[PDB]
Design a protein around this ligand. Structure first.
Ligand SMILES: CCCCCCCCCCCCCCCCCC(=O)OC[C@H](COP(=O)([O-])OCC(O)COP(=O)([O-])OC[C@@H](COC(=O)CCCCCCCCCCCCCCCCC)OC(=O)CCCCCCCCCCCCCCCCC)OC(=O)CCCCCCCCCCCCCCCCC
Ligand SMILES: CCCCCCCCCCCCCCCCCC(=O)OC[C@H](COP(=O)([O-])OCC(O)COP(=O)([O-])OC[C@@H](COC(=O)CCCCCCCCCCCCCCCCC)OC(=O)CCCCCCCCCCCCCCCCC)OC(=O)CCCCCCCCCCCCCCCCC
Ligand SMILES: CCCCCCCCCCCCCCCCCC(=O)OC[C@H](COP(=O)([O-])OCC(O)COP(=O)([O-])OC[C@@H](COC(=O)CCCCCCCCCCCCCCCCC)OC(=O)CCCCCCCCCCCCCCCCC)OC(=O)CCCCCCCCCCCCCCCCC
Ligand code: HEA
Ligand SMILES: CCCCCCCCCCCCCCCCCC(=O)OC[C@H](COP(=O)(O)OC[C@H](N)C(=O)O)OC(=O)CCCCCCCCCCCCCCCCC
Ligand SMILES: CCCCCCCCCCCCCCCCCC(=O)OC[C@H](COP(=O)([O-])OCC[N+](C)(C)C)OC(=O)CCCCCCCCCCCCCCCCC
Ligand SMILES: CCCCCCCCCCCCCCCCCC(=O)OC[C@H](COP(=O)([O-])OCC[N+](C)(C)C)OC(=O)CCCCCCCCCCCCCCCCC
Ligand SMILES: CCCCCCCCCCCCCCCCCC(=O)OC[C@H](COP(=O)([O-])OCC[N+](C)(C)C)OC(=O)CCCCCCCCCCCCCCCCC
Ligand SMILES: CCCCCCCCCCCCCCCCCC(=O)OC[C@H](COP(=O)([O-])OCC[N+](C)(C)C)OC(=O)CCCCCCCCCCCCCCCCC
Lengths: 97, 243, 171, 346, 211, 318
């Protein structure tokens, strides 16, 4: 029986009955919809298809198009390099002053 | 915070999970180029596919965009010295801010001069290309990059040229124009940098143009038909005119 | 400058600053040998920043007072020294905050309870290029082991670029 | 008398000391109404500007995702005009302005009011610097802790309001406006829906408040020699101090949003338990003990800096303008500041 | 040697009340042996570097940017002392145990970390001690750390505090002229009834009552 | 220090009854879910105790709160016992304040600045709290079982829909009204310890802070925090044993542990949980005590200061 802690006993179970969904029936329905339609229903924020004066973006742009040379970088194993040759070149002026 | 349900967030999570699971490190490739001639590699199992002396053919001192700033510096110095505008102490001190930043564009140009390719070799196996350049102070840099990292750019460098069917080489094999190539990940000096633009100048000589093109277009070159040349004509830290 | 706060600042930059900073460096260098656990980088950096700068802020004004003729061992002085005396007391309280951070870093390190790994990886000296190769191989393996559970560059860039999900009108 | 504990009030005889103008002396203008008014004004203005900047930046990002980024100044001007003309941009401006009112009235204004109510009476030194700034550390910590969870319901209301526009209309709550969503959520999903697993938000608010206020006050007092001894502009000095405080606050607050990203966005390993068990708090602890700091600073400017840094900077500037950082400075040798006037001229 | 029986209350898998330290995911110090002799780090591949051979495989390209997620390897948890066992290992038998060092290396005294709350004191040592030297001891005196209050009107005597006289000194002819010189700041209080009330701009608290 | 008391204005019996009832009702409404979590935490370790180590010792109040909210009832599901807890709390306060006021008015010193010592006031408050806890033991028993029936199996739940319903069910099922006072001695001890472990430490730290820092405004709140900590330390074992005796079903089969009294409950707690088992839910109990005391003291101070100002006491007498 109980008080023999060699094996677990349901008398020591501590779990609260799930009477209702925690955040409402609509929250439960949206959770189910996510569980079923994740990755299939992909909303697109509204942008006009044709806008005068703008060149449509059909492909990736080269690094020559950047307005700002970023400092930090990424090692392909997922590492984040704060210290880069760009960082060295950017620290040359400040340290000089 | 996760109890709030956002379908865009769920799509992002699904995309991350699917990229983690489906997309693998080992990626199959069918862009294989078989050269039409026997490749004569050197002692070190490499074939020289491009050679140039970029710093030798680069304007270093009297470059137009920067001589303007470096000539405007004395104007600010003189303005602070004599205070012709009858400004205040803080105003003239602000006038002296400029001479501390006008040489930064020249510094960045000089740094960009070290990404012009001096030599490029193709290693045996046709999957790795060695690139030798040097910082203007004479600091030689050597970097090995996978051939699939290369993406040729257009002549104006404003858009990605088509990875194939691009003609940056003349009929005889020499470069038709100064070719810019973007590398997705370049491990320079031991640090990986994303989207690095390197340059092959037209003034350089392109030995083995076919291989060179296959390196630029991203093809894996087949080096089965090869011979090895026994010629140790290069010394470590050999002097060159690119100084 | 005899018996002056110039001398006070001299031997405090020498003793309070330099000697105690060297003592702290030795404590950090032998932290595993002293306590058996890895030290706390964050609170250690806080202690380093607040203690080192506090010495400057507390004992450069004492140089300025010594040049102004402030004799030692007086609790009252001409009122033309109060500004730099206040600056020196501010620097001292910055140093006190640094000491608080040092005790906090000891407490947090003993909360952490992590075994320390030497940065040398068993090769303190690269006397030979073979030693350099061995260290490089082991370092790459160790870094790969550490970078587990952290998503790759592509996944991290995707998450960072698509972080913003708050839009008004959709299609 | 009334319950178990008796708040015994004891009368005490008179005491006094030599000096009176370097301890805690509550300012006259520091009343509840005045502090609330000034803090709310500064907070709502800073929040409005911050949310307008955020909406503009995000709509520029969207148009960049749809169209090529400009190559020159004229193309940049055209891009800005097209961003302004966007219906999505204008709706975002309106909704984020409502959110800005809500967050500057009850979060930033509350932070400023609590900080003033707690740090108004710490007087400075007449011709020196406030040497005992440590007395303001436990006080600023209490001010930051008290106002830490005030932004949580509004932040979660904004997340839920933007979280239903992305669902099919069969699963949407409505939410014509952010104010409507804020009014409806606590009665539909429950009040705890606005306070669940909000540890990253709470700790980010705490770090922002404490770092920003303490750093700005400390540098405004100590670096005053730059514009009191040195003859500088003092407004370039104020702006530099505010920028430094804002950068430090953003640096010390980003890792908790990083913890949220790690917990609920990092891809899972199949067949293995979650790394942080979906709590975010252990995540912070992990980030507190992670060896590679940069590994949790990626996307610092892309994700968080340009969405809170202008707000914090403008909050500092406007609080200084309205006088929420003004401390009493009285000479300790003349009149009210001293009780022993004999030893001031001999 | 030996060990006690099994109790599900001590099992994290069975007893859900045992909170799991996610920083001790793969480390179980209670199973540590002294000296440590267990290998827990070996060669790992197929994370970013494949374990197969694709060096000269023209059909295969390696993309380490697609590193599949793996279980995070936590930093090694330090050993936790087994008090009783430790108190049974370093125990000494007086006048019946020879003074010698055993041949086995397991007789080495290893340092295993213990409780943490003690270091809480070490966390608050710079604070408490300072309080102990300033608040508990009231150094330098009682009235230094108290909130500053000026003395009342003419307290404790008109010699130490001649406020009334000072009032006249500011209301007499000469005093007015002195204020006009600008070298004497205006009067900082007012005598209302038998009380002295400081002006708001004075920057001081009000005098306490004579309870 | 006995000269320093300030009793120039003393509220009437009607005034103390009304103010205590109103302010304590407000405090109980504000801080009831904390006690719900505390009772919940003390039941999930009724025979297990603390099994984690170092900083993880105890039961997480936030974890318990998240689980109870994930039950599905939301925040409204934390007041099931509050339906009956409020009546018991108010009756306890009424009886305690009546007895305290009577005994105090029959023994208080003549001088307005002379007040009974902390020991005499502790004796009076302990007697009052013991009497009131004995009289409100059925209400406290009904309240605890309502909270207890959430973390227990369906067979072990009493099913009380209110206070009178619980009283009737206990008087019918468990034998009679004599069964209404189960754990009455435990409640008496808990009230006695709680009534003597707050005023002492509070006045101690308040006066010492005033000596150190003068007449500041944070003194009373810091002293209140200290008093709440020490009252929680002194009272929590007794409150834990009271909860164990209240949640003990009449059927021995439906009990994780069976107790024959306060001593048996303490013995079994020491045997299975250990010494540290008495302080499970310490954070929740301490937060509840601090918030309750702060709300009551703040509102009572405001109201009584307004009444003193209306009555005409000098500003130093308030
Ligand atoms: C008239 C002349 C107009 C000149 C600029 C025209 C133009 O094209 O501007 C867009 C232009 C686009 O940048 P880009 O270099 O083409 O894109 C870089 C990446 O590809 C894409 O960018 P990223 O992924 O590297 O992230 C950029 C991000 C993060 O970058 C930063 O935060 C940069 C920080 C350092 C800046 C320099 C010091 O910057 C922002 O989000 C800035 C938003 C807030 C701007 C200021 C608002 C008021 C305060 O600049 C910006 O968007 C802002 C750059 C930083 C300005 C400070
Ligand atoms: C007021 C005055 C105070 C004065 C103090 C004393 C000054 C002198 C002594 C040096 C100390 C300087 C001051 C400290 C610097 C900052 C600390 C630091 O290391 O930061 C970098 C550190 C990152 O280092 P990591 O983790 O090793 O990086 C790994 C990454 O994967 C990224 O890996 P990675 O490989 O990409 O990058 C590694 C990273 C590592 O970071 C560093 O190394 C920092 C270096 C800072 C400057 C050091 C100057 C040394 C002295 C120069 C003059 C010598 C004479 O490097 C960098 O980020 C760039 C470093 C560039 C220089 C490297 C070489 C420096 C030493 C050698 C040159 C100088 C001597 C030459 C010879 C001279 C001969 C006469 O942290 C951050 O970036 C963020 C900080 C953490 C924030 C987390 C959230 C905190 C939340 C709040 C916690 C507290 C709560 C309560 C707050 C209450 C108050 C509000
Ligand atoms: C315990 C803790 C102890 C340490 C505590 C202190 C720790 C400080 C650093 C912690 C975090 C470091 C890691 C990090 O953030 O990584 C992510 C971050 C980028 O991550 P991400 O978001 O993925 O990339 C975004 C973009 O895609 C790509 O962006 P990116 O990679 O190019 O990075 C952008 C970065 C690039 O920056 C640099 O490259 C600078 C490098 C300087 C030299 C560094 C080396 C030498 C250091 C010497 C001293 C050592 C001590 O730009 C900045 O940092 C901006 C600087 C100016 C910001 C001023 C903001 C003030 C408030 C403004 C409010 C405006 C409101 C509107 C009204 C305006 C007025 C009308 O990486 C870096 O920032 C890497 C460079 C790090 C440089 C050294 C760190 C300190 C720099 C301080 C500059 C500002 C000083 C204050 C100016 C105030 C002016 C008023
Ligand atoms: C090495 C000795 C030493 C150290 C560290 C200091 C530290 C400090 N000293 Fe002093 N000082 C002296 C040696 C030292 N001093 C001597 C010999 C005299 C002359 C006596 C005389 O004039 O007759 C003197 C005199 C002196 C005066 C003279 C007063 C007067 O003449 O008017 C003043 C006032 O400004 C002053 C200020 C300070 C300050 C503000 C610090 C601050 O740096 C204090 C910062 C605190 C620390 C540096 C303690 C570190 C804390 C720890 C807990 C370390 C323990 C931890 C470990 C590392 C394990 N010192
Ligand atoms: C200073 C005042 C003391 C403050 C806290 C003292 C104890 C610190 C934390 C603590 O609980 O230690 C733990 C022990 C006593 O607890 P326990 O019930 O035996 O826990 C084991 C339990 N049976 C279990 O299931 O795990 O504690 C001990 O091991 C001995 C306690 C002695 C502390 C002071 C004595 C002098
Ligand atoms: C018996 C067991 C041990 C018992 C120990 C009891 C004391 C425990 C330690 C103190 C706990 C914290 C109490 C904080 C209360 C603050 C209330 C307040 O307003 O105080 C105003 C006081 C004085 O502010 P001030 O500067 O306006 O007043 C100076 C005096 N007059 C009025 C004449 C101008 O400030 C403080 O006490 C600051 C406390 C900061 C936190 C550190 C706590 C210890 C402080 C020791 C003395 C100061 C050292 C500063 C540097 C310390 C570096 C380590
Ligand atoms: C620190 C708070 C700072 C707040 C700053 C911002 C203030 C302004 C915004 C406030 C938004 C939230 C309040 C909305 C109020 C209106 C809605 C409303 O009341 O609806 C009726 C709500 C509805 O609750 P509900 O949960 O039934 O919601 C219905 C929806 N379902 C059922 C699907 C979930 O009723 C109640 O709240 C009843 C209880 C009264 C309030 C109890 C407050 C308890 C507070 C915590 C105590 C401690 C708990 C334990 C902590 C951990 C252990 C120590
Ligand atoms: C039912 C009746 C229960 C009576 C319980 C004992 C008296 C009340 C509790 C003790 C008390 O108030 O102590 C405060 C008293 C206060 O002493 P005091 O009243 O002399 O005041 C000390 C403070 N000065 C002098 C500065 C004003 O403190 C002590 O007695 C100190 C020892 C701790 C308490 C020891 C008894 C605890 C209760 C045992 C119950 C069995
Ligand atoms: C006296 C017995 C030993 C000391 C208390 C041991 C104990 O239960 O500690 C855990 C309990 C835990 O309390 P708890 O039940 O609130 O647990 C929450 C703890 N976290 C969230 C951190 C896991 O701690 C205390 O009781 C602290 C105060 C002790 C006062 C007496 C000394």
């Amino acid at each position: 029986d109980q008080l023999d802690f060699s094996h677990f006993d349901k008398a020591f179970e501590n779990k609260y009955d799930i009477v209702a969904p925690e955040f409402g029936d609509l929250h439960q329905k949206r959770a189910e919809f996510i569980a079923k339609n994740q990755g299939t229903y992909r909303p697109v924020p509204l942008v006009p298809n044709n806008i005068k004066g703008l060149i449509p973006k059909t492909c990736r742009l080269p690094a020559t198009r950047n307005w700002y040379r970023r400092t930090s970088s990424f090692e392909r194993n997922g590492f984040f390099n704060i210290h880069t040759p760009v960082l060295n070149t950017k620290m040359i002026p400040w340290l000089l002053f | 915070l996760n109890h709030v349900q956002n379908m865009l967030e769920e799509n992002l999570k699904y995309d991350a999970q699917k990229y983690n699971d489906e997309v693998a490190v080992i990626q199959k490739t069918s862009r294989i180029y078989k050269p039409t001639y026997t490749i004569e590699f050197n002692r070190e199992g490499e074939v020289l596919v491009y050679s140039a002396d970029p710093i030798k053919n680069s304007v270093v001192y009297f470059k137009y965009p920067y001589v303007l700033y470096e000539a405007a510096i004395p104007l600010f110095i003189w303005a602070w010295i004599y205070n012709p505008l009858e400004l205040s102490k803080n105003a003239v001190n602000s006038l002296l801010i400029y001479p501390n930043i006008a040489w930064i564009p020249r510094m960045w140009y000089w740094r960009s001069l070290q990404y012009k390719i001096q030599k490029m070799y193709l290693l045996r196996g046709g999957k790795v290309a060695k690139i030798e350049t040097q910082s203007l102070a004479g600091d030689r840099f050597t970097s090995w990059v996978e051939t699939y990292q290369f993406h040729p750019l257009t002549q104006d460098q404003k858009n990605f040229d088509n990875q194939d069917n691009a003609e940056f080489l003349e009929d005889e094999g020499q470069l038709k124009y100064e070719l810019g190539v973007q590398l997705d990940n370049l491990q320079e000096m031991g640090t990986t940098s994303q989207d690095i633009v390197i340059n092959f100048m037209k003034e350089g000589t392109v030995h083995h143009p076919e291989l060179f093109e296959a390196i630029v277009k991203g093809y894996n070159i087949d080096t089965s038909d090869y011979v090895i040349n026994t010629a140790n004509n290069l010394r470590a830290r050999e002097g060159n005119h690119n100084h | 400058m005899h018996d002056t706060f110039y001398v006070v600042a001299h031997f405090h930059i020498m003793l309070s600053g330099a000697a105690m900073t060297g003592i702290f460096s030795g404590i950090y260098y032998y932290f595993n040998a002293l306590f058996g656990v890895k030290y706390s980088r964050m609170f250690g950096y806080m202690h380093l920043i607040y203690y080192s700068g506090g010495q400057w802020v507390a004992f450069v004004p004492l140089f300025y007072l010594g040049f102004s003729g402030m004799p030692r061992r007086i609790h009252d002085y001409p009122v033309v020294f109060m500004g730099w005396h206040s600056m020196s007391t501010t620097g001292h309280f910055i140093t006190l905050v640094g000491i608080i951070f040092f005790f906090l870093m000891m407490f947090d390190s003993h909360i952490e309870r992590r075994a320390s790994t030497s940065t040398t990886l068993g090769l303190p000296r690269w006397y030979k290029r073979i030693s350099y190769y061995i260290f490089k191989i082991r370092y790459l393996q160790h870094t790969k082991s550490k970078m587990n559970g952290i998503p790759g560059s592509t996944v991290r860039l995707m998450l960072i670029n698509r972080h913003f999900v708050e839009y008004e009108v959709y299609e | 008398m009334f319950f178990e504990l008796e708040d015994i009030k004891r009368r005490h005889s008179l005491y006094w000391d030599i000096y009176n103008v370097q301890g805690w002396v509550r300012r006259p203008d520091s009343t509840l109404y005045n502090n609330v008014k000034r803090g709310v004004t500064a907070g709502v203005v800073a929040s409005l500007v911050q949310e307008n900047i955020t909406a503009l930046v995000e709509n520029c990002k969207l148009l960049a995702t749809k169209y090529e980024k400009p190559q020159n100044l004229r193309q940049a001007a055209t891009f800005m005009k097209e961003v302004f003309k966007l219906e999505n941009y204008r709706k975002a401006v309106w909704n984020r302005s409502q959110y800005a009112l809500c967050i500057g009235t009850f979060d930033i204004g509350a932070r400023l009011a609590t900080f003033r109510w707690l740090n108004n009476g710490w007087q400075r030194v007449f011709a020196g610097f406030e040497f005992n700034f440590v007395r303001k550390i436990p006080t600023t910590m209490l001010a930051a802790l008290f106002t830490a969870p005030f932004s949580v319901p509004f932040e979660l209301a904004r997340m839920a309001y933007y979280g239903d526009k992305t669902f099919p209309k069969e699963l949407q709550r409505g939410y014509s406006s952010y104010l409507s969503a804020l009014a409806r959520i606590p009665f539909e999903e429950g009040p705890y829906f606005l306070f669940k697993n909000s540890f990253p938000l709470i700790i980010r608010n705490f770090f922002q408040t404490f770092t920003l206020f303490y750093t700005y006050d400390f540098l405004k007092d100590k670096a005053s020699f730059a514009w009191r001894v040195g003859e500088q502009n003092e407004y370039a000095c104020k702006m530099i101090i505010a920028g430094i405080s804002t950068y430090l606050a953003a640096v010390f607050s980003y890792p908790w949003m990083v913890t949220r990203e790690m917990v609920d966005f990092w891809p899972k390993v199949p067949g293995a338990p979650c790394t942080f068990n979906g709590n975010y708090r252990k995540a912070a602890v992990w980030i507190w003990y992670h060896e590679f700091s940069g590994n949790y600073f990626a996307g610092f400017f892309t994700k968080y800096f340009w969405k809170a840094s202008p707000g914090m900077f403008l909050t500092l500037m406007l609080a200084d303008k309205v006088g929420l950082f003004d401390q009493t400075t009285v000479d300790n040798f003349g009149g009210a500041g001293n009780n022993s006037w004999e030893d001031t001229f001999v | 040697h030996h060990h006690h029986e099994y109790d599900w209350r001590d099992d994290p898998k069975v007893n859900k009340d045992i909170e799991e330290d996610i920083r001790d995911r793969g480390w179980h110090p209670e199973t540590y042996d002294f000296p440590y002799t267990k290998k827990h780090d070996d060669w790992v591949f197929d994370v970013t570097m494949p374990s197969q051979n694709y060096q000269t495989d023209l059909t295969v390209n390696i993309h380490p940017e697609n590193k599949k997620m793996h279980v995070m390897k936590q930093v090694m948890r330090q050993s936790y002392w087994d008090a009783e066992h430790d108190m049974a290992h370093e125990y000494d038998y007086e006048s019946e145990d020879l003074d010698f060092q055993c041949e086995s290396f397991k007789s080495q005294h290893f340092r295993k970390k213990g409780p943490i709350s003690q270091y809480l004191i070490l966390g608050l040592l710079p604070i408490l001690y300072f309080g102990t030297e300033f608040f508990y001891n009231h150094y330098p005196d009682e009235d230094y750390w108290r909130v500053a209050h000026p003395p009342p009107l003419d307290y404790p005597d008109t010699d130490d505090t001649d406020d009334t006289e000072t009032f006249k000194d500011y209301k007499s002819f000469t005093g007015r002229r002195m204020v006009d010189t600008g070298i004497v700041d205006p009067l900082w209080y007012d005598i209302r009834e038998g009380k002295k009330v400081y002006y708001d701009w004075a920057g001081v608290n009000q005098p306490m009552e004579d309870i | 220090m006995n000269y320093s008391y300030k009793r120039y204005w003393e509220p009437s019996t009607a005034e103390v009854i009304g103010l205590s009832l109103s302010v304590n009702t407000i405090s109980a409404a504000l801080t009831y879910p904390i006690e719900f979590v505390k009772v919940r935490s003390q039941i999930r370790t009724e025979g297990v105790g603390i099994r984690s180590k170092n900083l993880y010792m105890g039961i997480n109040p936030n974890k318990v709160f998240r689980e109870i909210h994930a039950t599905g009832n939301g925040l409204r599901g934390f007041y099931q016992g509050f339906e009956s807890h409020l009546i018991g709390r108010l009756s306890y306060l009424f009886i305690r304040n009546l007895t305290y006021k009577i005994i105090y008015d029959r023994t208080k010193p003549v001088k307005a600045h002379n007040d009974l010592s902390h020991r005499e006031k502790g004796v009076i408050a302990g007697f009052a709290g013991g009497l009131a806890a004995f009289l409100t033991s059925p209400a406290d028993l009904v309240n605890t079982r309502t909270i207890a029936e959430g973390g227990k199996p369906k067979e072990w739940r009493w099913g009380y829909k209110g206070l009178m319903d619980g009283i009737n069910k206990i008087a019918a099922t468990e034998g009679g009204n004599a069964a209404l006072f189960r754990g009455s001695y435990a409640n008496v001890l808990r009230a006695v310890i709680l009534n003597i472990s707050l005023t002492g430490p509070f006045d101690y730290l308040n006066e010492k802070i005033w000596i150190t820092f003068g007449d500041m405004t944070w003194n009373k709140y810091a002293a209140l925090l200290w008093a709440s900590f020490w009252g929680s330390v002194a009272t929590l074992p007794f409150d834990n044993i009271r909860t164990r005796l209240y949640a003990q079903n009449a059927d021995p089969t439906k009990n994780r542990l069976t107790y024959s009294g306060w001593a048996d409950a303490a013995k079994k707690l020491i045997q299975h949980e250990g010494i540290s088992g008495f302080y499970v839910g310490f954070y929740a109990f301490y937060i509840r005590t601090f918030l309750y005391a702060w709300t009551t003291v703040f509102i009572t101070d405001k109201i009584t200061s307004d009444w003193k100002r209306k009555a005409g006491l000098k500003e130093w007498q308030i």
